[PDB]
DNA sequence: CAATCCAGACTGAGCACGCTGTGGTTTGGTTGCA
RNA sequence: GGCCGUAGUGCUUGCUCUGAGUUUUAGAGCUAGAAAUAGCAAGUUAAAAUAAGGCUAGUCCGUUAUCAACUUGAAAAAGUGGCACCGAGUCGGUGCAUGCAACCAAACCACAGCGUGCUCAGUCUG
DNA sequence: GATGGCAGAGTACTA
DNA sequence: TAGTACTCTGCCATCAGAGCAAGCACTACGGCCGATTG
């Protein structure tokens, strides 16, 4: 047995580890090897790293599940429509639906006529000539009044139902309101008629252009207000206009209503809101509100319709037909123009599907943007194409009916068209008249988001409860699904449990019991002092009850003056009163009690005890439910208790928020001795006046015992469940689980003796989003910088360009305009200096013409600059270009700047880890490692867990020449773990007073101490520290510069580090989601069981779960002889279950005969094989391999590469370049090492020759450039999948090992989580 | 001529013995006891042939009879210290732990020779052959003892139980003692003058004159003849002044030491290993009663005896070895203690080692009875010289009690520490009771003593 | 009035380690005689 | 530093929805040519599928997490591998692993006395 | 984004 | 010579939205909270 410490470093896809002794020396022991090879033992250093693929979130799985559910529901809608139509469809055409179902079928496979609608070619051609598109048929059905074919009626209705539209706008829409200016004039006329005191005229104002502008709604409101005299914003007219355009205006200022009176036109509660508002204010404003509603409908419709509706009842269909006609006319004109002006490109434009143009636009896969990009130069270099270019610029040239911009069509337009069709056609078909309501319900029914899936107990995502067991259809959804209980379950299944009482659910935040509990908790910890009192008293239960009943239940917020006057002076009759322990105004107050008092108007009911259940139910309903309908249906049982008006007010009132304490903990549990609850104890507990924490921590009472019994009940879950319940990124959670497993394995390895200390560290850790953010900011601010020079997302990916665009093209510190073309010449300066903290985000980075404009570089920008540009920064913040945090950091100078305490805190938090995830990791490790208690049931800290930040190790490496290069190999993870262990152990040995802030368990003076915390390693600081360091007050040596640095250097230069790639069975998608066209190949996968790939297309590139080594016999040649074969078979994800069910049958089906179950070997990804000369390969797939060896470059070469390459960019720097110049001849040795390693392992002859030729040709370049490019050459000799790299201009492609034949006679190695335990299986024997 | 007169008493003519007075004895067992069967342990071919003649003769006498029993113990031969007779031993290891325990009444060798008075100068030592086989064993307890013996020549294979008391049994020495004592108890009454000493089987007859011994020997032979016990005639010293008994020479009423025993101690060369030194110590220790101040003489060799140590035979160790070799060359003649007369003990203590001599009156001179020497305990080692003598007397007085048979004795020492015990300047209270008991000990006139004594 | 900045000693209890004395089990050795 | 309150950002989980995209089929191509071929015309839409599929038959579920080898188990799970030193090109080598009595020594348990350090309560001081 | 699948062109060995 | 059969090289990967609810983690802002010294 020997004392040792375990050092760890945790990453998203790597967990290094290292075991050290008391002298900072990595041990080494012989490990037995199992299997069947001749080798029986192996020596390994106790240092290594584990590599694995990064974890993934469930966002993609959730999206896929939602898509599946949506497709299923769409098919169900189609089935409902067919069931409605079937009885009459049988008479009209019996096999119509059958023909529709088999449209996706070749002529031979079809059991009916290939024509799906009428069944004969004459009628098919006639119908397609009469109605070129479905919109023609829809408009004809809407407009015409004669009898129509039932098949055509069903086709139009089915198209409308299948493609409904967005449900963003609630309520109802009437498409008859189309014009904008005329409706605005009509609204102005109503305004003048009603409010005749002051005239309102909008003559000579381009209302249509102002309102239909693409700018923001607020910008449009401001423009309309400015271009209208006699009124301003927040007026009655301004509020009406804001409500019409979409903004939510407060109508209190318009009528002095003293309530919120906020209306949103799109919301479903607008009806009730307007009803109560009109009841309060009078009915004369109903005309104005209706005019505003009509104006809003016209404004929202004119964006998409763009067609008059006085001649037709199908505006969307008419617009689609107009687009079709414009496409036809433009196509004919373009055809004629090309044929006449330029006949040299007619074939490539109108016939070549490979290139863009009309052929690639229609027949090919080219998009509208690509077509426009291809046809813009051709259109410009022509004659008589001015209108065509105008249409192209307006994005209205040769538009298909079904486009990506069709996402703004509400479902109300389709509903109106369907209603018109049904109304027209209901005369001839009685069943259409009888089923109109249910067809409309089919079109306009959606499952509420709180109901969730309509399962029957076989779903883990469902919570809906059913009041009946019949099948749920849209026509009995209300009669079957329990909406209120479903919504309650939806909210409750996500809310948190009580931390002190896990078993019970937490109370609502605004609960009356919670408010009483908080008020009493704050009240019991106060002490009053009056004349003639020797010692302060605690305001015992009677006084507390009097104070509660006379102060909190009468005023919203309680103050000390009111406490002294209304109670102490009035009742206690003590003029001199000295309260203590509380501020001027109490924090907690009965907020909910006062809200109900002004509504129910019953003090006796509010004070009575037997209705506390009713009050809790009311507040629970208000917190749980968001929709007015469910609130009302839940409060129906209480209709008897309160009159209709009070009921309506209660429905209107809504609370948000949930508490952290359970009702059982607050009031249910009672003390065993006297049967008193926590609330009763707070109300009166002798004269001690204990609070909640004292009550639950008191040993005499049984509260602690009851809490411990409940907490123990259920028992801690598994480690996997604990890590899953932890909050953080899935990659970090996977790293934590792997770290725990490697810690357990190391403890088992080292003689089952726990380490003295454990040191851990964890690393800290879009163009389209940036584009949408800048678009929103530009629209809000009204600027035209984007219009001046459009910028693509790839261009916006540049940091400097992004900063310039966010700053609106202006300097952040002076009132000047910067030039986009003159970029790459200014400097980017962080708001907070880089010395204080490490943060390179956009939230802290600011681009300015000159970094000197801020003034001092050691603090927040100058007060003069802050005062100069505070207005501009406020405008940018209101434009959402900058964040609230960025604004607060920028304007810190006015608040006072960075104080010395702030500087000290900034420098302290750099060396100390404060992350909740790291705290959780430390807690888990401590709980697992230490499990022995003491005589007083106190845990003994057998193992100490220390958390450090990466700054200490990075500074150690930089200061003492332990430079790290990440491109050499993967040994840097193990080196980081070892250095973390060494630094942590040395720190805790040197400073035992710092255990609180590191081990899990003055301002000026505090500054310099933290800055010089790592000085005891240094020799010359000119102060000369002793060579041997000591703890102080003890005879313990914590460092020895004579030999400990040499020991660290020796450890960092060991050529043996246990690097292990975690083998994983691939899971996920079956194959690539792309559907390829039909082709003669066996690689295609059928999309359905009956769909032949060679006739219908299918998927390709299946994902292999795990390879299987099978030894069997196959039939080769016409003789059908059995040739023994040993080969790797890739079991894809789709067939994994079938292979597991019957491996024998699965293998025999593929063609193998006489397989061997014993010889069957399952090989997941990253399986390691040892071939010869130490050459290792990892199984990438069934027919590919990966590199599996690491290059142990000498530390001298690593340091030279770092110093020459200038990683992370006076006298100290002067000697570095001199050292590099002296050691110029190291580049040849590095190249020789790379070449010999490649020849021994990589075996890429052509790539190595190309690399050597490039290096020889680039021998005259400077040493800095040469080393920086030599760093790239290590991609050739790396671990993992081959990758392409670059040496100066020359580029080198991948060398892929696409053969797995040689690994069938190699040695297969099974490695544990640390790699010290192995099982070498020789495959040549098989 | 002795053999002819008493054919029923000598083993060479009387044949096998059988106690005609003692009844068959049942060997009891504990309440929680079960039969145990142990296979016969492997025995070398040379040791097997040693016992084989005994089994053949034991079968004829009826001592060993074939039987079938669940009890079985492995036979084991033990060769005599002389020749290769290979006496038969049953090796009842398991039975001893299972058989009940009785209070031993065997006499310890220290106290037998104390009963011999110097007045009785004529001796007659008779040793009973096959002593333990005389007592009959009840057939109920016969299955308890058994062993496996298979010889193709004999033609009988199986267990052969014992009809008499076997050898190697833990209760055999005790059961034979009581049985023989009762039979000879009647003999003691008839002859008050004779002094009969009994040690398991060895009998010693002490008489005043030659005629008294001759008459006593005939009566003893006749008494033992009727009782069935047979005495060996090959080794039976009858009516001789020089006799050997209990390993001690008896001449002129003095407990001499055999010349052969002295040769063995000196004959061994200088020890070289702790085992070699341990062997020599025991020989010297058995003679400790003759060597004056043996505790201090062999003091240097004691710390070398420890199992954990280095055997460094230094000059001091060689000096201790030479002292013991020369002391045994001129060992004196220890006299037989006479219980009628009072005893006298000299006590001296130098350097933490107590030495002394127990003497008795012989005319005008004092004759040594036994040389007493001891090592003081470490608690008394650090005491001052005045207090060390008090502790030395208490240790030596305890040793004298085991030989004086509790008779009063006089403690003589150079100093006058006898008054110091009354008024010394837990253990001390224990020492006060031992030294102030006027019934058993007293202090005579204070006087020094010669260093040799 | 405004802003900035626990340690030691003694007493009582539980030990825990080192030394001395007694009691007891068992192992080596020593003879004796069995 | 701590608390209380709030304003914002980011991330995670779950639910309800929309627009496209892809694939097969339908939308009769014409003329001159034996045939390839050439010249014109046309192009905008619709049906079905959107992980194969499963049984639990629901307007449900099916891409997250977890997973070296061997033994014991239905399974959940539990077990399986010596140490030190000198070295270093992916780890190597060396070395170790029958009975009786009394007296003396090692070690063990229990108790009594002395010296000394750790933990808890109290007091005082700073 | 990167790594494994896949089609196609190319070269090689045997019936 | 025809037919498999293995190897190297370049192309290619479904994408965009809209709401709701709960939780955690971190970042600023306002207000507190004591005692001592200048």
UniProtKB/Swiss-Prot annotation, chain A:
Q: Any phenotype upon disruption?
A: Loss of correct processing of pre-crRNA and tracrRNA. Loss of immunity against a plasmid with homology to CRISPR spacer sequences.
Cofactor(s), names only, from the UniProt record: Mg(2+)
Similarity section: Belongs to the CRISPR-associated protein Cas9 family. Subtype II-A subfamily.
Kindly provide the name given to this protein in its UniProt entry: CRISPR-associated endonuclease Cas9/Csn1
Organism for this UniProt entry = Streptococcus pyogenes serotype M1
Motif residue range(s): PAM substrate-binding: 1294-1296
Name the CDD domains on file: Csn1
Q: What's the top EC group for this one?
A: hydrolase
